[PDB]
Structure 1
Amino acid sequence: MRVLLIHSDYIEYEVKDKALKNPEPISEDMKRGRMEEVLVAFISVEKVDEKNPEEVSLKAIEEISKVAEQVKAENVFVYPFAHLSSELAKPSVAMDILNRVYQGLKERGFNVGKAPFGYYKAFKISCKGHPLAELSRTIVPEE
């Protein structure tokens, strides 16, 4: 799994066209959303993660939170992102890992937001541009 953590003044999106045959069904409220003083996490679930989803989700949860501490971010937004990896994971496994992380983040006490999986979204992001405001992580299962 490949993560891109960007501490933003805000993140905002809008669901345009579908990018898959069967994207995550969403209710009206999810068609768009906005989060402020947030740590944005663009995540590319990779094929190797299909071996051990739990270890990879739990591992990513601990690494996202750690950084949410460092930058004193109270809100974390999970952004399903397909362009951080070449070897992407099967759509079904991606959604699953992303939910695991989303949920596991919610139970850590963070206000968590999320962009709907499987769609093309337009979006605005404002990176704070500080020393630790931009990080990248790799979370892969152990053999």
Structure 2
Amino acid sequence: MRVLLIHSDYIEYEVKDKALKNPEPISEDMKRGRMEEVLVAFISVEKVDEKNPEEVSLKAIEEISKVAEQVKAENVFVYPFAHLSSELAKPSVAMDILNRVYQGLKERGFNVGKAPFGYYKAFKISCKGHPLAELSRTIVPEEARVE
């Protein structure tokens, strides 16, 4: 999994065309969204992640939480972004992992937002530009799955 962390003043998105023949169904309310004073987590689910989906999600929740604490962000935005990697995991698995992370983050008590999976989206972001406002993490499975 590849993760690009951007501490921003805001993040806005607007769903455009479907990128997958059949993407995650959503309502009018989800077409667009906006968060402020937020740590934006652009995430690319890689093939390897298919090995131990649960392991990776936990790892990412941990890594993402740590940066949030460091930069002191109470808001985190999970953003499906399939361009941080060129070895992508299949959609079904990707959407699942992305959901766990999101869920795991709310479990940590952060205010969390997200963009819908499987669409091309327009977006506007404003990175603060501090030493810690731009970070990356590569998280891969290191254990066998048990299911």
Is TM > 0.5 for Structure 1 vs Structure 2? yes
Give 5+ residue unaligned stretches, structure 1. none
Percent identity (aligned): 100
Could you list the per-position Cα deviations for residues 7-45 of structure 1 after superposition, in whole angstroms to 9, with x for gaps in the alignment? 000000000000001111011110000000000000000
- Tell me how far apart the structure 2 counterparts of residues 28 and 111 of structure 1 sit (CA, whole Å): 21
Q: Tell me the CA shift for residue 63 of structure 1.
A: 0.1
- Tell me how far apart the structure 1 counterparts of residues 83 and 122 of structure 2 sit (CA, whole Å): 15
Q: Tell me the CA shift for residue 108 of structure 1.
A: 0.2
The TM-score with structure 1 as length reference comes to: 0.99
Q: Tell me the CA shift for residue 75 of structure 1.
A: 0.2
The number of aligned residues is 143
- Tell me how far apart the structure 2 counterparts of residues 85 and 11 of structure 1 sit (CA, whole Å): 22
- Tell me how far apart the structure 2 counterparts of residues 104 and 22 of structure 1 sit (CA, whole Å): 26
Q: Tell me the CA shift for residue 65 of structure 1.
A: 0.3
Could you list the per-position Cα deviations for residues 37-67 of structure 1 after superposition, in whole angstroms to 9, with x for gaps in the alignment? 0000000000000010000000000000000
Give 5+ residue unaligned stretches, structure 2. none
Q: Which runs of 4+ in 1 moved over 4 A?
A: none
The TM-score with structure 2 as length reference comes to: 0.96
